[PDB]
């Protein structure tokens, strides 16, 4: 009948970086991960991601927003 959502599937990919389990992942590791792991991204792609990642001035990123973008289109 009705099954869960795949949103959790995408989150799992983020939870990998959230070792603290606080709902956030270090912004710095994201850059390396996006440029070092899986089809490396370019600086232009990374920069766009950073502007959306967060880094307002805390140095941490909430995968929640990334998920919303991935689930807001």
């Amino acid at each position: 009948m009705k099954d869960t959502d795949s949103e959790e599937e995408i989150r799992e990919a983020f939870r990998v970086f959230d070792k603290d389990g606080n709902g956030y992942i270090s912004a710095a590791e994201l850059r390396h991960v996006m440029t070092n792991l899986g089809e490396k991204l370019t600086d232009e792609e990374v920069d766009e991601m950073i502007r959306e990642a967060d880094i307002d001035g805390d140095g941490q990123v909430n995968y929640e927003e990334f998920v919303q973008m991935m689930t807001a289109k």
């Binding site: 599937e9 995408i10 799992e12 990919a13 983020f14 990998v16 970086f17 070792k19 270090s26 590791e29 390396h32 991960v33 996006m34 792991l37 899986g38 089809e39 991204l41 792609e45 766009e48 991601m49 990334f66 973008m69 991935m70 289109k73």
Partner: protein, 33 residues
């Protein structure tokens, strides 16, 4: 980082996010016609 780089799951997870990210950008530039 402090993550299991060796673990295939970590590498696979990176791909899924990146794959979705690339598609996300395309959708933004996408047009109804």
């Amino acid at each position: 980082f402090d993550i299991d780089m060796d673990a295939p799951e970590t590498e696979r997870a990176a791909v899924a996010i990146q794959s979705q990210f690339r598609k996300f950008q395309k959708k933004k530039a996408g047009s109804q016609s």
